[PDB]
Amino acid sequence: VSAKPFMETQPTLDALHCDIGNATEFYKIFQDEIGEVYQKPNPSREERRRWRSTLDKQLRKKMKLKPVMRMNGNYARRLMTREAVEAVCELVPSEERREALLKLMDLYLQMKPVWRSTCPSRDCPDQLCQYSYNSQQFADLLSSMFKYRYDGKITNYLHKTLAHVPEIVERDGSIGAWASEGNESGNKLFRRFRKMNARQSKTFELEDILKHHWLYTSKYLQKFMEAH
Amino acid sequence: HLLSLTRRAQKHRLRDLKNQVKTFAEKEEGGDVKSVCLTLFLLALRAGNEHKQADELEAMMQGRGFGLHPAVCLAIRVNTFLSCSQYHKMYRTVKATSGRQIFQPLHTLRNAEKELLPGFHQFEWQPALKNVSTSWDVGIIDGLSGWTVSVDDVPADTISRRFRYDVALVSALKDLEEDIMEGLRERALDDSMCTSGFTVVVKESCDGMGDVSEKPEKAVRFSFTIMSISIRLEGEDDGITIFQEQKPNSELSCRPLCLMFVDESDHETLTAILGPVVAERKAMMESRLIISVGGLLRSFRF
Amino acid sequence: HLLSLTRRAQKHRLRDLKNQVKTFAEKEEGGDVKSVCLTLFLLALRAGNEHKQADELEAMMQGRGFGLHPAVCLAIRVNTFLSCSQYHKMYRTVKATSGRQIFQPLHTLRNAEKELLPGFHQFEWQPALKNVSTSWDVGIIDGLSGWTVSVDDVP
Ligand SMILES: [Ca+2]
Ligand SMILES: [Ca+2]
C-alpha cells in the first residue's frame, strides 16, 4: 500500500475474462509435456518452439484448431475439453502424467461454470458444494505433478480462482452478476451515438449524446418495444 | 357480378339469406345481425389466409384508434437512431399521404420526452443530504463543476457533462415503479403496510474508452444500473426480493451518469472531475429517500 | 356473447348457419361466400347509419385496403436515407404498437419495387439497333465491359 485510496471498490473477481490465464497456462503445460521439463529442466530457445509447433498441428489434425496469438473466448472454450486433452495425450511419451492431466482437466470442467454462473445456489449447487475439495485436489495435483513451474511464480488469475471463489459466492450470491462487461458493451453505443446524432460543438455535443444514451437505456421505452 | 350491381340489386338478390341470418340470430344471439355478420365475414376471411384484411377490419371496430401514443413515437425516434430532421421529413410525408396524424409532430414529441429525463420527479430526503443543494429540478449539470478559468492555475480545459447522482436515481426508480408495483401484486404483500423498508442494491462501473474515430481522443463513461430491490418489513426478513434484475449485463440496462474527455491513466484530472460523484455516493449511503410512487410516499435505503 | 369467444368456439356455434350460407352461395353465386357475406356486412352497416365505416369498408375491399400504398412506403425508405434493418425494426414497432398493419413488410417491398428499376418492360425497336444486344431484361451490367483479366495487358 503506497497511495491514498479514495474509491470504495468491492474487490470482486471480474467474471468476464476470469479464464484466459488458466487456458494459456494449460497451453504452456501441454507444451512442456510434449517437452520434458522434469527430465530436461533447461530447454533451449527452440525446443519450446518445436514443441508448440508439433502440438499446434497435432490439434489441427484432431480438433482442427488453427494456431493463434492470444486466447479469446471461443478458442479458450474449445481448448478446455476432455477430448482435446486425450488428443494431446496421444503425443506425450509417458502415460501416467496422461491420466494425471486427464483428471486435472476433469476437475477443471467440474469447477469451471461455478464462476460464470448467475446464481449457482439454484443453477448448480452441486458444483458449489463439491468445489472446496475439488480445488483442493486441483492444488494438490498442481503441486505434486507440476511443481517444476509453480515453485515461486503464479499468474494472478490462478490465485484468485483457486483461493476465494466459494467464499466470494457465499458473501455476495453470484459472480457473473457484477461483470463489468455490460458497461464495456455500451461503448459501441457511445462512439456510434457520436456519429449520427452530433450537435456538433464540444460545449453541446455531450449534452445530446448523454440525453440520447439515457433515453435508450430506460425500462419504459423498451417495454413498448415488446415484439413478443 | 354481385359486387358490380347496385344496392337495389344486392338487396333484391340477398334478402333471402338476410332473413335466414335474421331468424338464426334471433334464435341464438338475440338477433344481433351486426355481430353475427361480423364474425361470419371474419371467419370467411380467416379460411382464405387473409390475415391482413381481417386484422384491419378488426382494427376498424373496437377499437379504431388511429392514434399513435407519443411515447412509442419518441421511442421509435430514438431506439432506432433516426435523426431529427429525418423524423420531421418522414412525418410530413406519412401525413400528406394518408389523412391521419399518425406520428405526433416534433415539438410535442420533445415535450412528452422531457418528463422522462432527470429533474422532474419531486422527492424529499430524511435528513437533508450532506453538502448538497435541496434543489431537485436541475437537469444536465456541466461537468466542469465550477472551475476558476484563471490560467494561472491548472487549466480548466477538460470537457465533461453529467447529471447529479440522486436525481438520476429518483428518475430510474420512478421508471421502475411499474415493475415494483407488479412485484407487490405477485408477492401479494400488503399495500398500506409496505411503505418503509425498501433496499435498493446498485452496481457501479467506470471503464475507459479509447479513440472515438472520426475525420477529442479518450473518454471515460461512469455508469450505474439498478440491480435489485427488496423489502425490510417487518420481522427479521433476511431477504424479501421484490425484484431481481434479469439481464444485468445486457447493455440495454446500463445507464450513464458521467462522461469526460480525459485519459484513463492520469490520476490528476480523473480525480478532479470525479470528486463530486465520490462525495455524493459517500454522503448517500446513510440518509433515506422519500419518493411518491403509486400514490403513496415511501422510504428507501441504499 | 358471440364476439368475445375463441375461433374454435365461434366456428362451433356458427357452423350450421355457415353451411346454410355455403349452400346458398353454391346455389346462387357459385360458392363465392366471401363477396356474399361482405355484401351482407355492407348493407347491415348502411342500415346502422354509420356510413363512414361503410365507406371505409368499401375502400378496403378492391381498394388499397392494406392501409398504405407500398410505393410511398418505399419512397419513405429511400427519400430519407433510412437503412434496411432500420426499416424492419421500425416495422416491428409500428405493428406491435397499435393493432394495425401500416407499414408494408420487407420482401413485398422489394418485390413491389423491382418493377421500377431498368430492365423490366418489354419494348421493340424499328429498325433493330446497330451492334446492340437483343435482350431487354438485363439489369445492372458490370461496367468492366468484359476485359480479359490477363495481367499481361493493361490490367
Ligand atoms: Ca480497459
Ligand atoms: Ca477496456
UniProtKB/Swiss-Prot annotation, chain C:
Compartment(s) where it occurs, according to its Swiss-Prot or TrEMBL record: Nucleus
Complete-protein stretch covered: 414 to 568 of 1057
Assembly with partners or alone: Homodimer. Component of the RAG complex composed of core components rag1 and rag2.
Reported function: Catalytic component of the RAG complex, a multiprotein complex that mediates the DNA cleavage phase during V(D)J recombination. V(D)J recombination assembles a diverse repertoire of immunoglobulin and T-cell receptor genes in developing B and T lymphocytes through rearrangement of different V (variable), in some cases D (diversity), and J (joining) gene segments. In the RAG complex, RAG1 mediates the DNA-binding to the conserved recombination signal sequences (RSS) and catalyzes the DNA cleavage activities by introducing a double-strand break between the RSS and the adjacent coding segment.
Tissues/organs with expression: In the adult, predominantly expressed in the thymus with lower levels in the pronephros, mesonephros and ovary.
Domain notes: The RING-type zinc finger mediates the E3 ubiquitin-protein ligase activity.
Family per record: Belongs to the RAG1 family.
Official protein name in the record: V(D)J recombination-activating protein 1
UniProt DNA-binding residue ranges: 1-62
